[PDB]
Structure 1
Amino acid sequence: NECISVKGRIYSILKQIGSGGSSKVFQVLNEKKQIYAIKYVNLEEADNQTLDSYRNEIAYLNKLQQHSDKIIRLYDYEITDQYIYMVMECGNIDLNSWLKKKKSIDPWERKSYWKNMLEAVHTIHQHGIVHSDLKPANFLIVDGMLKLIDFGIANQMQPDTTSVVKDSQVGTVNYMPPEAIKDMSSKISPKSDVWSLGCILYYMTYGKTPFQQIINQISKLHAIIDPNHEIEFPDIPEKDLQDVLKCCLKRDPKQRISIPELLAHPYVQIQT
């Protein structure tokens, strides 16, 4: 059936994982029958700003390879004026797809994923990137590890079928930090990613993001910035987890906990 050549290396297409804006992802095999994911981007009719954002995303992905194995591997790539191919490490399943099909998450699993997420995001912060759009879909489960897939630089959407890609009703403000919303009139910092990570852990803890129940988007944004609107933190066995969540979801980012401090938190450091 179909092949893709990248830097002269031939890859046969096992299957298509999804589509995007003008994008496709495929599971492929090399000549030794080792599996990879190839992202294809059609550059035809794409503007400098999008090109530049992909160029910049690739440069960062490329550079940060060496710094953390909680970043998706970029084995190789090919860029012309007409297209991009990126040869990347293939995963098992994204975190959102995984969480959506899980009844309840094992406490140990949750903690372990939490550590992976902190480390990946810590890495990008150390190279001056604030992602600013973190959600479960930005993480891929690989060998039982979470790996960050993108840096929020590229104007890309993670792979899905035709109906989802053309669905105007996807794109949540459920993970959006208060300081971004008050920005609207640079409030965004590494603390913004802490809030979003906090919403992911909260989800993995209580089965919903903090404001998921507010269905009107404008109402939801109103609740996110409203200090008087209390976030519920139901008592749970893991008191360290409960604390983490309270520390990540402080509306004032100066009061909000940082990543280096999350990495020294009991929830992360003390076992059983």
Structure 2
Amino acid sequence: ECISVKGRIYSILKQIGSGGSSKVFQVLNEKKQIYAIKYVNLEADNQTLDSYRNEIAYLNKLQQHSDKIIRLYDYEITDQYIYMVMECGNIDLNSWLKKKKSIDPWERKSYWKNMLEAVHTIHQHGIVHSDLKPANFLIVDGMLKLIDFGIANQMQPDGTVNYMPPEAIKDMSISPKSDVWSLGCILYYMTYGKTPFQQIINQISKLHAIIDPNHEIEFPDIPEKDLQDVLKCCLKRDPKQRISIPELLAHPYVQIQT
């Protein structure tokens, strides 16, 4: 019911996430301010460990570079456990997406800008998140912020190959373009109400479909003509043909307000 980090005590309001020996708690400090504490039980290969160490260091470093990256106020690391005190936000994008029926065009555009800026920041520092999904983004102050960089083991709020890029499947035996496809699927869902290959319930079929150039993705007409173009450009199977993050930041959909 209580946790301590660097001589500071927090009260466990509730658990909001879980994973491989890892938990996320909604907490309050002495002055009743709210924060998110990530607990990691280190009793974990030399490698799983180094993966958490790497994530912590990049998250910390990347703090200064963008307000679209989640805030890490402090952390406690020992041979037994890891405690991470960070911004708590309102709710993760994945949970919020399920509760809302329709999404506002302005909100969708603002959110897309946030995601783009966050992924852009991590790319400039040589990080390619490799598993991008809505659960990786947190809604804080009517704005989206990136929670993790996909370096450490992934957690889930309290998996699917829907957002999986084709190059990652073909290369079965790394480019920043992979994050573009994933972002495209998130925006596609934000626009059409589902991921491009959501219907395929058969997984090996879904996989074959994601990679097959003959399997055409549906882009039914909409009033925002730019959005439709963004989606088309983001969902190019060939990574070389696929639009880049710097190009997406200069796209009319993001640049020109309607």
TM-score by length of 2: 0.98
Cα RMSD, aligned residues only: 1.1
Deviations 1:207-236 (A, max 9, x none): 000000111110001011100110110000
Separation in 2 of the partners of 1:188 and 1:225?
Answer: 17
Deviations 1:185-210 (A, max 9, x none): xx931100000000000000000000
- Whether the aligned pair in 2 keeps the contact of 1:3 and 1:10 (CA below 8 Å) is yes
Q: Tell whether 2:210 aligns with 1:212.
A: no
Partner of residue 194 from structure 1, selected from 169, 180, 192: 180
Separation in 2 of the partners of 1:191 and 1:178?
Answer: 11
**3-state secondary structure, aligned to 1:65:** helix
- Whether the aligned pair in 1 keeps the contact of 2:17 and 2:155 (CA below 8 Å) is no
**3-state secondary structure, aligned to 1:264:** coil
Deviations 1:73-108 (A, max 9, x none): 000000000000000000111111011111110000
Separation in 1 of the partners of 2:198 and 2:2?
Answer: 42
- Whether the aligned pair in 2 keeps the contact of 1:17 and 1:25 (CA below 8 Å) is yes
**3-state secondary structure, aligned to 2:156:** coil
Separation in 2 of the partners of 1:33 and 1:244?
Answer: 43
Partner of 2:231 in structure 1?
Answer: 245
Unaligned runs of 5+ in 2: none
Separation in 2 of the partners of 1:70 and 1:18?
Answer: 21
**3-state secondary structure, aligned to 2:15:** strand
**3-state secondary structure, aligned to 1:86:** strand
Once the two structures are TM-superposed, the CA of residue 18 in structure 1 deviates from its matched residue by: 3.0
Separation in 2 of the partners of 1:246 and 1:141?
Answer: 26
- Whether the aligned pair in 2 keeps the contact of 1:25 and 1:38 (CA below 8 Å) is yes
Partner of 2:221 in structure 1?
Answer: 235
Deviations 1:95-140 (A, max 9, x none): 1101111111000010110000000000000000000100110000
Separation in 2 of the partners of 1:83 and 1:36?
Answer: 19
- Percent of pairs identical after alignment? 100
**3-state secondary structure, aligned to 1:228:** coil
- Whether the aligned pair in 2 keeps the contact of 1:198 and 1:245 (CA below 8 Å) is yes
Separation in 2 of the partners of 1:215 and 1:17?
Answer: 29
**3-state secondary structure, aligned to 1:76:** strand
Following TM superposition, the consecutive aligned residue runs of length 4 or more in structure 1 with deviations greater than 6 angstroms are none
Deviations 1:144-183 (A, max 9, x none): 1100000000013133xxxxxxxxxxx1111011101010
Unaligned runs of 5+ in 1: 160-170
Once the two structures are TM-superposed, the CA of residue 17 in structure 1 deviates from its matched residue by: 1.7
- Whether the aligned pair in 2 keeps the contact of 1:179 and 1:188 (CA below 8 Å) is no
Separation in 2 of the partners of 1:17 and 1:158?
Answer: 9
Separation in 1 of the partners of 2:152 and 2:91?
Answer: 21
Once the two structures are TM-superposed, the CA of residue 65 in structure 1 deviates from its matched residue by: 0.2
Separation in 2 of the partners of 1:15 and 1:85?
Answer: 16
Separation in 1 of the partners of 2:154 and 2:189?
Answer: 24
- Whether the aligned pair in 2 keeps the contact of 1:113 and 1:145 (CA below 8 Å) is yes
Q: Tell whether 2:180 aligns with 1:182.
A: no
**3-state secondary structure, aligned to 1:66:** helix
